[PDB]
Amino acid sequence: GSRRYDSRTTIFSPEGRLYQVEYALESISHAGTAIGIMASDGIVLAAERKVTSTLLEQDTSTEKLYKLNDKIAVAVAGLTADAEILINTARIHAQNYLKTYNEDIPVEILVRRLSDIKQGYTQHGGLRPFGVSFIYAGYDDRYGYQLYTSNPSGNYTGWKAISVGANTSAAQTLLQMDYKDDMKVDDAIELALKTLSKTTDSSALTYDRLEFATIRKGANDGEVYQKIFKPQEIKDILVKTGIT
Amino acid sequence: GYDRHITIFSPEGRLYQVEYAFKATNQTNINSLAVRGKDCTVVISQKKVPDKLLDPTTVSYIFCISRTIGMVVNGPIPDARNAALRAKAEAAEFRYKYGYDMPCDVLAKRMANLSQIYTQRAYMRPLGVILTFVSVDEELGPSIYKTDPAGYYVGYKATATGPKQQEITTNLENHFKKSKIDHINEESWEKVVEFAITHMIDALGTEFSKNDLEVGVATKDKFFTLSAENIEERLVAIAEQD
Amino acid sequence: DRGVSTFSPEGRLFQVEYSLEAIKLGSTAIGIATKEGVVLGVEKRATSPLLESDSIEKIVEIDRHIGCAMSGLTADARSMIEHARTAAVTHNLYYDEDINVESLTQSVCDLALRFGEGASGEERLMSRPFGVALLIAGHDADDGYQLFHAEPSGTFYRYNAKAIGSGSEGAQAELLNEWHSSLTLKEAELLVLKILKQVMEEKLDENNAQLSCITKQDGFKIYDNEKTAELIKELKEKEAAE
Amino acid sequence: GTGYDLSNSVFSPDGRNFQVEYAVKAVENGTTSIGIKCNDGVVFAVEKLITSKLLVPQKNVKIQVVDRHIGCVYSGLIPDGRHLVNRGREEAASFKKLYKTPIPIPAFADRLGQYVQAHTLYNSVRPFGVSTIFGGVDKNGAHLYMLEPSGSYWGYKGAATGKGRQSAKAELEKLVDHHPEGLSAREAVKQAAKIIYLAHEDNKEKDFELEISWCSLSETNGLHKFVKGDLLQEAIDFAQKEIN
Amino acid sequence: MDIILGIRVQDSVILASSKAVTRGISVLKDSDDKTRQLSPHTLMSFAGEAGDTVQFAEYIQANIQLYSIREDYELSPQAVSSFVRQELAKSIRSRRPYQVNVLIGGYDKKKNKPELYQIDYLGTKVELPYGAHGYSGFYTFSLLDHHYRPDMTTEEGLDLLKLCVQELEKRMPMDFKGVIVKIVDKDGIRQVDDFQ
Amino acid sequence: TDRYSFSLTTFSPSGKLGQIDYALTAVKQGVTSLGIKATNGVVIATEKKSSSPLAMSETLSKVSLLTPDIGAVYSGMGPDYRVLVDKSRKVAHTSYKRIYGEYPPTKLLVSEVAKIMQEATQSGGVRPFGVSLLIAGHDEFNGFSLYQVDPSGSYFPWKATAIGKGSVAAKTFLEKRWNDELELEDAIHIALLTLKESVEGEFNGDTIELAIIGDENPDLLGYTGIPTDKGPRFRKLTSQEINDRLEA
Amino acid sequence: QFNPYGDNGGTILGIAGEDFAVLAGDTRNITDYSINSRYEPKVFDCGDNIVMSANGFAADGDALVKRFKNSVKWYHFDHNDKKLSINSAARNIQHLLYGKRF
Amino acid sequence: RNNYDGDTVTFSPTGRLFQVEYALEAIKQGSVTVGLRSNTHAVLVALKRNADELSSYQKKIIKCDEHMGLSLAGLAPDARVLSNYLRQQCNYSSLVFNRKLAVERAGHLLCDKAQKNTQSYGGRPYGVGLLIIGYDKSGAHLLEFQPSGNVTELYGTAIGARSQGAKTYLERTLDTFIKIDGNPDELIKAGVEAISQSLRDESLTVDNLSIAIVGKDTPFTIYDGEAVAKYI
Amino acid sequence: GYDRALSIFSPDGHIFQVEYALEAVKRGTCAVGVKGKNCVVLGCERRSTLKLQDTRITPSKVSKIDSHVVLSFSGLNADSRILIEKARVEAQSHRLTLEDPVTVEYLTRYVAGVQQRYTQSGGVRPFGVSTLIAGFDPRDDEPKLYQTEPSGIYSSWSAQTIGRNSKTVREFLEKNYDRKEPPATVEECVKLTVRSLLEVVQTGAKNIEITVVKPDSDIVALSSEEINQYVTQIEQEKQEQ
Numbered sequence A: 001g002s003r004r005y006d007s008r009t010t011i012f013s014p015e016g017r018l019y020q021v022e023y024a025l026e027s028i029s030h031a032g033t034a035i036g037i038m039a040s041d042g043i044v045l046a047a048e049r050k051v052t053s054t055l056l057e058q059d060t061s062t063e064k065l066y067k068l069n070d071k072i073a074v075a076v077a078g079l080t081a082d083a084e085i086l087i088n089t090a091r092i093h094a095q096n097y098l099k100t101y102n103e104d105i106p107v108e109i110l111v112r113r114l115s116d117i118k119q120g121y122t123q124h125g126g127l128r129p130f131g132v133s134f135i136y137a138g139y140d141d142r143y144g145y146q147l148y149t150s151n152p153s154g155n156y157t158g159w160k161a162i163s164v165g166a167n168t169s170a171a172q173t174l175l176q177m178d179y180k181d182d183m184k185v186d187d188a189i190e191l192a193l194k195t196l197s198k199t200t201d202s203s204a205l206t207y208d209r210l211e212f213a214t215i216r217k218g219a220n221d222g223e224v225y226q227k228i229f230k231p232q233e234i235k236d237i238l239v240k241t242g243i244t
Numbered sequence B: 001g002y003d004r005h006i007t008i009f010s011p012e013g014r015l016y017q018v019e020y021a022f023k024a025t026n027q028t029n030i031n032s033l034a035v036r037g038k039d040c041t042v043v044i045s046q047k048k049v050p051d052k053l054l055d056p057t058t059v060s061y062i063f064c065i066s067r068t069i070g071m072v073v074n075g076p077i078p079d080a081r082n083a084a085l086r087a088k089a090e091a092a093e094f095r096y097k098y099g100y101d102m103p104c105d106v107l108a109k110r111m112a113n114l115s116q117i118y119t120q121r122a123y124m125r126p127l128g129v130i131l132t133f134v135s136v137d138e139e140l141g142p143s144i145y146k147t148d149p150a151g152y153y154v155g156y157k158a159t160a161t162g163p164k165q166q167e168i169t170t171n172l173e174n175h176f177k178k179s180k181i182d183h184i185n186e187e188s189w190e191k192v193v194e195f196a197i198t199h200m201i202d203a204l205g206t207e208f209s210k211n212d213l214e215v216g217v218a219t220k221d222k223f224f225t226l227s228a229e230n231i232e233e234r235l236v237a238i239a240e241q242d
Numbered sequence C: 001d002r003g004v005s006t007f008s009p010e011g012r013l014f015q016v017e018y019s020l021e022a023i024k025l026g027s028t029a030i031g032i033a034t035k036e037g038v039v040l041g042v043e044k045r046a047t048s049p050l051l052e053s054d055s056i057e058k059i060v061e062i063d064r065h066i067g068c069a070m071s072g073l074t075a076d077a078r079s080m081i082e083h084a085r086t087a088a089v090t091h092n093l094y095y096d097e098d099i100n101v102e103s104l105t106q107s108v109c110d111l112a113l114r115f116g117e118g119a120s121g122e123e124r125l126m127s128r129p130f131g132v133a134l135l136i137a138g139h140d141a142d143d144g145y146q147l148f149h150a151e152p153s154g155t156f157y158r159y160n161a162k163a164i165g166s167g168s169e170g171a172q173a174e175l176l177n178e179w180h181s182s183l184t185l186k187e188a189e190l191l192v193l194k195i196l197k198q199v200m201e202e203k204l205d206e207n208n209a210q211l212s213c214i215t216k217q218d219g220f221k222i223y224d225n226e227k228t229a230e231l232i233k234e235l236k237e238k239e240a241a242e
Numbered sequence D: 001g002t003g004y005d006l007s008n009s010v011f012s013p014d015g016r017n018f019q020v021e022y023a024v025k026a027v028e029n030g031t032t033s034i035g036i037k038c039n040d041g042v043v044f045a046v047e048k049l050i051t052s053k054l055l056v057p058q059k060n061v062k063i064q065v066v067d068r069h070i071g072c073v074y075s076g077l078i079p080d081g082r083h084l085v086n087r088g089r090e091e092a093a094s095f096k097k098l099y100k101t102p103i104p105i106p107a108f109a110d111r112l113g114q115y116v117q118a119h120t121l122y123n124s125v126r127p128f129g130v131s132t133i134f135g136g137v138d139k140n141g142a143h144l145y146m147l148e149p150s151g152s153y154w155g156y157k158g159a160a161t162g163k164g165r166q167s168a169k170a171e172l173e174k175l176v177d178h179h180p181e182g183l184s185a186r187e188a189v190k191q192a193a194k195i196i197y198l199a200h201e202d203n204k205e206k207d208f209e210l211e212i213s214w215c216s217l218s219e220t221n222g223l224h225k226f227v228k229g230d231l232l233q234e235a236i237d238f239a240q241k242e243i244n
Numbered sequence E: 001m002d003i004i005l006g007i008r009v010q011d012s013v014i015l016a017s018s019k020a021v022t023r024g025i026s027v028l029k030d031s032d033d034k035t036r037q038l039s040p041h042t043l044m045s046f047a048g049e050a051g052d053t054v055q056f057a058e059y060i061q062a063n064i065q066l067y068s069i070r071e072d073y074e075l076s077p078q079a080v081s082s083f084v085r086q087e088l089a090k091s092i093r094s095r096r097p098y099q100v101n102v103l104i105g106g107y108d109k110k111k112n113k114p115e116l117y118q119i120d121y122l123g124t125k126v127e128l129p130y131g132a133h134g135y136s137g138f139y140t141f142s143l144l145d146h147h148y149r150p151d152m153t154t155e156e157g158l159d160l161l162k163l164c165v166q167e168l169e170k171r172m173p174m175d176f177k178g179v180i181v182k183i184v185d186k187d188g189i190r191q192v193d194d195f196q
Numbered sequence F: 001t002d003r004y005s006f007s008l009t010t011f012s013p014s015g016k017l018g019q020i021d022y023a024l025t026a027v028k029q030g031v032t033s034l035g036i037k038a039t040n041g042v043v044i045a046t047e048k049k050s051s052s053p054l055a056m057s058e059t060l061s062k063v064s065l066l067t068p069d070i071g072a073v074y075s076g077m078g079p080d081y082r083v084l085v086d087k088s089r090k091v092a093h094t095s096y097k098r099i100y101g102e103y104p105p106t107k108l109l110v111s112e113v114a115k116i117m118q119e120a121t122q123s124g125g126v127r128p129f130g131v132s133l134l135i136a137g138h139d140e141f142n143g144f145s146l147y148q149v150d151p152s153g154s155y156f157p158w159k160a161t162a163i164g165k166g167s168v169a170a171k172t173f174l175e176k177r178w179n180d181e182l183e184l185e186d187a188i189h190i191a192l193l194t195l196k197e198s199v200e201g202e203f204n205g206d207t208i209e210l211a212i213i214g215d216e217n218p219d220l221l222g223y224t225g226i227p228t229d230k231g232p233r234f235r236k237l238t239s240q241e242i243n244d245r246l247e248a
Numbered sequence G: 001q002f003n004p005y006g007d008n009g010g011t012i013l014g015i016a017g018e019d020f021a022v023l024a025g026d027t028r029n030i031t032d033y034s035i036n037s038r039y040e041p042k043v044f045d046c047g048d049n050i051v052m053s054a055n056g057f058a059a060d061g062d063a064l065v066k067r068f069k070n071s072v073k074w075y076h077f078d079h080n081d082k083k084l085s086i087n088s089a090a091r092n093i094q095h096l097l098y099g100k101r102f
Numbered sequence H: 001r002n003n004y005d006g007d008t009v010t011f012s013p014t015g016r017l018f019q020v021e022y023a024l025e026a027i028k029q030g031s032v033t034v035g036l037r038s039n040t041h042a043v044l045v046a047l048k049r050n051a052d053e054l055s056s057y058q059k060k061i062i063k064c065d066e067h068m069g070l071s072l073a074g075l076a077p078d079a080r081v082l083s084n085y086l087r088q089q090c091n092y093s094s095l096v097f098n099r100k101l102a103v104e105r106a107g108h109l110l111c112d113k114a115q116k117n118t119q120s121y122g123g124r125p126y127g128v129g130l131l132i133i134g135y136d137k138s139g140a141h142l143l144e145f146q147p148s149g150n151v152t153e154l155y156g157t158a159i160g161a162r163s164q165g166a167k168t169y170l171e172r173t174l175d176t177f178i179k180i181d182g183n184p185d186e187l188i189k190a191g192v193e194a195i196s197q198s199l200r201d202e203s204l205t206v207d208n209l210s211i212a213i214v215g216k217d218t219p220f221t222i223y224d225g226e227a228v229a230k231y232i
Numbered sequence I: 001g002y003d004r005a006l007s008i009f010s011p012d013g014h015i016f017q018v019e020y021a022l023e024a025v026k027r028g029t030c031a032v033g034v035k036g037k038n039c040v041v042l043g044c045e046r047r048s049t050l051k052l053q054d055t056r057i058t059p060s061k062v063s064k065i066d067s068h069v070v071l072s073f074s075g076l077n078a079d080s081r082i083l084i085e086k087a088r089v090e091a092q093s094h095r096l097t098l099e100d101p102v103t104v105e106y107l108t109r110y111v112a113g114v115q116q117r118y119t120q121s122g123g124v125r126p127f128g129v130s131t132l133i134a135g136f137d138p139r140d141d142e143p144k145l146y147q148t149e150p151s152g153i154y155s156s157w158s159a160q161t162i163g164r165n166s167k168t169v170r171e172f173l174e175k176n177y178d179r180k181e182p183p184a185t186v187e188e189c190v191k192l193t194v195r196s197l198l199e200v201v202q203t204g205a206k207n208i209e210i211t212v213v214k215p216d217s218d219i220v221a222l223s224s225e226e227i228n229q230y231v232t233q234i235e236q237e238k239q240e241q
């Protein structure tokens, strides 16, 4: 029969690891780094594009930053295409919660379901895990600003600041040294970029090779705003950090 | 390498099972060719009957698919018949649903898309055959369309298939460079058959009795095959020009 | 490697043969059939001294007139137990009567070879056979007191006495000696202890071995530790005697 | 690569399907069986090897009938042959239920053809271990077909398969040449007996029982019938004297 | 139908719900509670066809309990009521519809308000200061329209209710065997010891 | 019996997905196609590769209309392209036009194609598609656009690019020439040059296929009377129109 | 409307003696005002010393008797040729009937 | 050596199905059983195998209808599937057509049933052989089933360990026994003799011998225990 | 359609996919449970091998199943979630049909069964998870502590531990838990739990979490400050004498 051709994607190694997950994580280590940092008054998401030609159209590009919802966003690292599948089912989970309960979906609840999905690919049906890691940034009113991460194993964890993809050992260390809790949002913006300057394998860090986003309850009214920075806004912020 | 056993990519980006299926097409050692007249289309195929115990009348690689479409197959008979039946079914279903006779080129397209699927899905094997469809289409005139195990298809001015395909093809390429047109300039199909047999004897360097060939002809609103006798008529006509 | 339903050149099912190696490794279990009843005993084999050994249930009730003991991967047995209970109860719903022990066992054994990859339904299948054997003990009016050994090969055998698990090899040569027609129930209880005490690594006591019997009059009962302790002692005394 | 011969739908690099080729060996290895077209009917015959004297003579019938007018006989794996007829019978019943007319022999050949070819398409199934000789009388006269594990079939004047196939084929080639005008049914029966006796001489070591049937327009009325009693005897006689 | 009333005063929500259960010709019981607590600060009362009413409530209950455990959190009364409405709205186009009407009274700890929701068997939901199901509205809305003030105390609420139950005892053909009354407030849910 | 319910594309220990890589190799071996974006239009172009001179190359469309405002071209295995075109046209109707009564905008249709491609990268019993597509279109709220879709399922927008054999060379050549004030006629001019490097056979309107997403063509609508329906923005060029331009 | 039922009856009578039992029925089978048979027996021996009769609509009665006998035969196969006690037979028949409760 | 024995859908290059051949090997390792017939009766005789001195003797004979039944040698659960499948076909023939099912047809059905498992991925073949006897509208019958699918009609035979003995004896005894018409006991004694050219180091007891008989005016019935002392 | 048999027997009678599953547990963080006269306490270690960890939102290691039963685990975290969801659902369903909450034994038995099923069905691998389940039965004060493991085997324990270095903390307890005189206070029982973790965690209440289950659904997690007292105070006893 065809069980000769089946590389069994759901098994344990003799150490009790899941081959395909480990391998997908390996894959992810070569993706653009992404970063999330949470302040008491907002969240920052920053990410590095895969070295992009001069002819590539950077206005309409959205390789790493995606809106799930009016209040939750993700930064991706890994296979774009795999991610867009996941993003989309999540956008729908949010809508279903909203429609059942007439309340926007709490961030963890969403994160958990999406992680539960990845977990299933890891335990049944012989398909290959999704080669994606996610940073989720969101606001709800049970826990305010929140930051989470998930990977191909289905595991998720919450963070004050975190990175995924390339050079995370390096980047984690550097945040660990400079993060403080009272941190304001414009502090976090600055810290996010410092970290990618140091971390990037490319010799400079320039506007055309970044995606950037914030979630502010700022300013006057209690409502929450999500901003995905355009190329010109990112160039300005880079001058203003004297990284350029 | 199991990238050799099923339809997945080799590291060079190749589907060996597709390549090996092409190879199987030549197992019968039969050559075939098709050409176009002013208002007909003709196919010619060798016919070999090695065994003395076979009923010769049952030995054929040419099929009447529909009222209007003929198909000739290069390759082993079981796969030929499987593709024949399939196309018969498709052509009839098309008519029922859309209210007109299925066109050659569209049927070719469909049959090609079926082949394409065996190249992408693993539990299906490609068929070891090359189908040449002919008709006189009501929109397009005399037409020839060819399909292979890659899932590829194209229309032809004329064409030839088999081991000695190259000889035959170059012979025809030459003829049309001279003649400057894309068809045999002939009113009667009886002479387009004569042309076809002639231009084939010269390319294969070999002579034919009436039992060495099969012929099929597509006129406007019928595709039919010839009997040894209507063939014999043609071989006599050719001989009158020594 | 090679599918789970394959035969070895000796005509044996690999997965089933290997199943039996799991069973040789499990705690020990012994059954003895008499005219006054049937006794069932087990080694508990706590894995650490913090383990509350009450919680180790290797002897279970199936109906009032039928009990069960197990050695092997004991998790595997929870669903064989479920099926057997369901079969006994179900029988009695349809027939206003107790199921025959024989029939109940045959029912359990029918599960054993339903494993595979197969397809698709009618039914789906276990991926592997069960890694557990059972002694099934009961009374019915047709054949009286009865001990069966039900293995994952699907076969089952009646025994006047039987032992399964890590002890079985010697434990059985010992049963061959000791057993005769005329054993009283009490003789049989002590025997089972005698043989467990021998083959257990641990020093036997009321906390690491457990006893049960089934009699027509009182059905199947597990014995408490106090009742068992007093039979351990009872045996200690007869050991003083030669 | 190697192992092009382990899986059933696979093409070797020379263009071939080795599992079908191996099924042909299972056939070459079976007992001898044949078909002879006479000029209003057809005749089937088959060597039944006698393992032991404990077989009941007359009673292990290897020729099978389909509908009322078609005979099949096969060399190779017998249970596969029976399986194939069971299919053939469904096909003929379906055809007749819908179209009223009993199935035409060519139509019926292609039915088996397609079903057999179908078992060379997938690795999860195994090709048929038989060649099948069959035919009968339709509204256009007599037809004799033979069908290989690959689903190749053609029409024959005569046909043979199994161990004896070469002595039989040579012998049939005779008949064709030394009776160009056609052969009467009753003569074709006797010839068939002869030919089986001639082809038996590959393994004289074993004793054998002969079985013959015919479907003839004049003699059996276009229905398929076994030859037995006096006519069977008379054809066994003709076979004895043709040996000496 | 049976009697299902509710009123949202200033600091709590009061639910009044008839005690009788009758099967045709006999009154089978005179002490039946037509409520389930869905979470500590959320109470649902209900009425409609036999079997359906309870099955539906106990199913809603178990779902909200499941939610609470899973999230270690108590859904807002608004959310519970939207959940319930959606379930009823699925029921109507189903093979056999749940014929059940409910009132949901909750205290919303996050906004420190009481809230009353009325939902009929079609999934028609509405937030109200006072409500009822079936014919119960016909007798009592006159009085509530007149007397209701949003700043009423619980005691005032209970008086206004006493008057409503009297009007029902007077003008309504059925003997519904009194009511059980519960209060949902910031400290949770309790039952009024006696409606004498 | 489809036994093959498991992925045939899996992660190697290095993190590669071999079958996606190998598909990309098939693409690289394919004939050069390219696309370039002007301000008032987009052009996509490729080389017809006549397999016999007896074949009629007009009967091979390498450039395909997907919707009246959207076209495609490819490098790699043409059969895989043919069935992706069928699939894409259908999904534009079922998952967009049948709902909103208008054709999907370029990027959304690209997602749908991308998605199909991804599925063949993860589902049971299939290999990935061995093509890269360039898709060009226009829609009222995004204007003109150009996307590349890869076997992995990944896509990305471009001002201009190229795929297949000569693509590194051609991408270099396009960087020299592309500005953001390019008018459509000028981009065609450039497309023709950039193609001409990558080809040593005959180079003219019979061996070159080329389409534009431009102004609306009411002469190609088929009916008159609804002032709000203007023609398709998509148009293949004629053998003639091409040679005409091979003067400049 | 096709009406799937009919009435052939039929009268049957069963009496329990103290060490014996009888079961009796007329042998006449009717439809409306017609006789179909003057001898069409309706009491059957089903063989674990059990006699059965199913009076009413003849076709449904025949189906039931068939099914029960088959049940007896399968009880044997399945329970080591055990004899089927009358009370077990009765339970078994409740199940056959209730099987068609609707 | 032998990649070709991994499943049933794989032919060897010589043309063999190894998995089937390995299933036939389970039969030879089974305990011996013998079948034979006159024109009026058919008889099974079977040697049952116990595990210990403490254990039952596994039954080898199964009744399939009043007029038919069989003995097994090899994988017992498998016989249980097949004999059950047969009971159903015997039953279906009675209920639907009011007809005792012919032994020839039961033969054909078992063949077709076994053949399924030998052409399909995932199915192992059956690991049991069977002797079936029946008395039907054309008198006494005996069949031998193999899990390859081949069924063959015989006057006598045996299957299982050392059965070559019992078979050679039957070949020589033939004309004696073929005429034991209207005599049940003689035919049994002639079966029991046969089964003896097959015992190595043990002889027939009351506990290990089972016998069945069927025929004209005698329904398929099985003797064991006291009932068989008669002939031992 | 994917039903490949992944948990099968090898020739020595072992089932490697299940044994490999235990390897995942051995790599998981240590968890431990000990029972009092009338509390049960569950303690688990954290990795502070990273410390920008948002501890209020990040999944806890101890989970409520019902208001009277908790469950903790070692091994694959993603896998744990699925056992917990199934359990929570079973607990609510049990109330619905029997009108009583689950016994701890029942709930354990349920979860073990799920685990077992996944060692015997096509298309799936076993759970990389081992569990401790604790609580009190309804209207009952005798505390319960149960353990499950990937094979589906379960049993109860006076006290027990699982995860990396479990065999070290098992030693410790194997000789510090008196079955005749189990910890009579909560405070006492919490102390014995922290003690046993301190053999292996070796930082402090940064890395420890405790949860105390008492009768009548009285469940509570400690905050690091109050846990700290138990740590700081364990020091004064080991050193001075």
Ligand SMILES: [Mg+2]
Binding pocket: A085, A089
């Ligand atoms: Mg999904």
Ligand SMILES: [Mg+2]
Binding pocket: A096, A097, A100
């Ligand atoms: Mg929802």
Ligand SMILES: [Mg+2]
Binding pocket: C090
């Ligand atoms: Mg039941």
Ligand SMILES: [Mg+2]
Binding pocket: E090
């Ligand atoms: Mg709806």
Ligand SMILES: [Mg+2]
Binding pocket: E092
């Ligand atoms: Mg309505």
Ligand SMILES: [Mg+2]
Binding pocket: F220, F221, F222
């Ligand atoms: Mg037009």
Ligand SMILES: [Mg+2]
Binding pocket: G005, G006, G007
């Ligand atoms: Mg009526």
Ligand SMILES: [Mg+2]
Binding pocket: none
């Ligand atoms: Mg041997």
Ligand SMILES: [Mg+2]
Binding pocket: E062, E063, E066, I089, I092, I093
């Ligand atoms: Mg529930």
Ligand SMILES: [Mg+2]
Binding pocket: I121, I124
């Ligand atoms: Mg499952």
